Symmetry: C4
Subunit: 243 residues, 4 copies
């Protein structure tokens, strides 16, 4: 695998993929984290969208954002997804790094904006950040993240279009709706355990704005968890020999 | 951009686009505002559809109504959407104004009908109208509306069909389901802040029937917010150079 | 319009359309009414699927059942839908009557089965039947039903395929998912008012098994309401000149 | 029907179908059972995803997993589905048995993993296992399972693609989303009665890990129920003469 292919010299489009990933990840974090705070700060019992509403916000936004960005960047919005595709040789090392930089920067800004708009409740209620919940230990959280990310990266490899790519690249287009639903499904099982990471940029962004020691102690789980899940899904895609 | 193109002299279809936008916006306001009142007036705790149900009503109706009207008018049902497309040169100034007139008239009637059917609870519970919620100030509400409308108008520009248009026009057909989901997603994050406007006609219609001074004080947010969000999404569509 | 066309002499397929409508309507009533009783009989607060879950059951089943029956019968599962299409000249008088007989018989059986399986709670909690709720009067209920059925029959006329028909007929295939969502959307607004009819067979079936005088007093609303809504949607389809 | 066809001598693909069914069923049980435990163990009233969230987890995962596995194995993830298709002569006896072995093994592992990750709450709250709920007797549970499985297997026969098959087989591809929704719809009606089986491997897996005498007493319902539902749906598919 070289570090880069001729398609990274199409600098106009490469720039635009990066921007697309950047903005999408912002949008992602803003809408989802704002749904979290608004639910946690509600005084009325059942006066909110509930944990259900919060799972839809994550799944729904991924659907919407992959829909919008699949023909521009490939619609990753998530370093573990970019990592998995990189393992499967669909992304060069150079586009992979440019993508995770964009995704993490975008993630920080979105959580940023959510704090700007409601600082009080943002800090009081966890700041949207991921961590090990009471009653589970680290290895459980890690297993949960490995397996949840496997479910998302396995759906992504089935959602790849074998013939169509993003503008001026060989990066596959992705069917937005199954991927969105997998995100949704994994939240309904994972919110009680880690809040659900399965997206290192989404976990990184909330750690950066929330800035708590508890949160940062846990943060390794949400890189290693997902990256391992991603790698096991790549291994599986290649072994059920199907790209 | 001229004020009008030869397709506005196809008066039969132009008339029918306008009617289509008018009725859709009625339908929109009636179903969504009626879901709001029915939830707010319920005596049982969790005896309602909840804020979740209320977000589906907005997202779902947009999906249904864009589905029905995309080949007739282009399926805008929302002046900020018509404004955005106008900025992007997909709509002439003349069809744009005819559309927002239709959308606002339709919006007033739908909220009208919801009051006709349940006057007591309609007035008692906020009348479905948008405003700045306790604990947020005006600039926050405005930011929330800018960004929420950006998410909807960004999804709309990705949902445009580059080859197919509404009857007897060059106005693009739109993929109803991503647009509906974006409406849904933006509510789950915005209902606690402004109730969610992102649609000047939807905010205008509830202000007109509810008629409260509090509500009218706030009403500028729900024109300026969305129109700015719309303009920033147009700017972005044109810069990620993709119509 | 003759009373019947040569396609009603294809007796094999005509028989099978009727059976298809019959069974679908059973399935419809069984799953939806069983979701109602199971929710109403739950002792735990928020221990149920909620009014939200109940709206999905109606919308979801319509989606599933139109999906299954659209190429066999046209996927009506609802006399107001069959009535509307009949008005628009897509169904002969003879197939229309055969369809509503099948739909009402099927509806009675499904509610039948729900009573068979849980007689205690079935009778105690309203028996799934439609009626005017406390705090609304008859004209409101009727308006609600007119307009809710308009929303469903308007979505159905946009969901008609202009080129593809059900086996051995000129009855149009229907896009199941927008129609299902319209059913869903109309429930979120109507459950507090009448429980939502918008389907005379669904209202007739629950009236027949529940058998209460209150319920039967109201039952005219759920024929006249929907049939009027259906007729206004046909009138509109023909005037926005679009079959 | 012979016991096997030349397509079971394509051992590479046959092996891979089996693995695909195996892993999918694991994924299925892990995500769904983990959503159950996380909901049942929550201390806050409405602090969970609710019975609604739990129904989405089952429906959603089936959608996601049929999406991923339809072109590899045919996307059954459920012995009653494999049984039904076997009755309809779409699956040989030999692939049918290999599939249910894979499905049951996979089911056991998924519930396995859910216990590994949260042993305390897993055992305390029912272990995700199916059984007859208080207030219903065995024949009711059985009827509920017959009919619920009929709804799923009837949707599956309408979701079969008549022209496209899984890799190196004559096993039909299936439209994932109607099948997923039917699973969802059947839960909203059945969760109060048996928890919803309609999948012998899903019931078998939770019986094996939970290991309770109550649960095992009931377990016959969740084989006989679904297999009968499946057989009645096959009979119906063949009689509404439509494969």
């Amino acid at each position: 695998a070289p570090f880069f292919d001729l398609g990274e010299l199409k600098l106009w489009s490469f720039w635009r993929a990066a921007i697309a990933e950047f903005i999408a990840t912002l949008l992602f974090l803003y809408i989802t984290v704002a749904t979290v705070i608004g639910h946690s700060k509600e005084t009325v019992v059942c006066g909110s969208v509930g944990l259900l509403g919060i799972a839809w916000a994550f799944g729904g936004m991924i659907f919407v954002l992959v829909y919008c960005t699949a023909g521009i960047s490939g619609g990753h919005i998530n370093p573990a997804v970019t990592f998995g595709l990189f393992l499967a040789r669909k992304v060069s090392l150079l586009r992979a790094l440019v993508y995770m930089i964009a995704q993490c920067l975008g993630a920080i800004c979105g959580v940023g904006l959510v704090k700007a708009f409601m600082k009080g409740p943002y800090n009081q209620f966890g700041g949207g950040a991921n961590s090990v919940a009471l009653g589970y230990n680290k290895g459980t959280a890690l297993g949960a993240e490995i397996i949840g990310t496997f479910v998302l990266v396995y759906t992504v490899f089935s959602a790849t279009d074998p013939k169509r790519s993003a503008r001026d690249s060989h990066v596959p287009i992705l069917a937005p709706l199954p991927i969105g639903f997998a995100v949704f499904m994994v939240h309904l099982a994972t919110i009680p355990i880690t809040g659900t990471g399965i997206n290192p940029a989404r976990s990184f962004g909330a750690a950066v704005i929330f800035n708590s020691n508890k949160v940062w102690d846990d943060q390794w789980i949400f890189w290693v968890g997902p990256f391992i899940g991603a790698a096991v899904a790549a291994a599986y895609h290649q072994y059920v020999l199907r790209a």
